[PDB]
């Protein structure tokens, strides 16, 4: 086919690999920041549920 086909294919391959490397580094930094301070969707450790707290009036008023 000629040298231009291999040239442009190499450029496309390099762009794909560079974007993948950038995204991998971004993923590492995002995971580290989330686990350091959990504020995104990931590393959300559980907590006792609100929906099983009895809010009805008790036998004792001081509750």
């Amino acid at each position: 086919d000629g040298p231009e086909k291999n040239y442009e294919k190499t450029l496309a391959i390099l762009q794909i690999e560079s974007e993948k490397a950038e995204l991998r580094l971004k993923e590492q930094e995002v995971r580290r920041l989330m686990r350091a301070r959990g504020d995104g969707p990931w590393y959300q450790f559980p907590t006792p549920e609100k929906e099983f707290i009895d809010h009805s009036p008790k036998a004792t008023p001081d509750n």
């Binding site: 009036p57 008023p61 001081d62 509750n63």
Partner: protein, 57 residues
């Protein structure tokens, strides 16, 4: 932390009933039917405001 506030002996003084439990239980039904408005006002304030220091009146 903060200083807990609580009323004094002068505002905790009241004319106590000084009446035994048996006579209280003998008069329980008519006492519960005569002034249930006052008792239910006290229970409503006691269960709404959990603080006993704001239901003394």
């Amino acid at each position: 932390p903060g200083i807990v506030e609580l009323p004094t002996l002068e505002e905790l003084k009241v004319e106590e009933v000084k009446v035994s439990s048996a006579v209280l239980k003998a008069a329980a039904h008519h006492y519960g039917a005569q002034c249930d408005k006052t008792n239910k006002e006290f229970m409503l304030c006691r269960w709404e405001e959990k603080d006993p220091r704001r239901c003394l009146k």
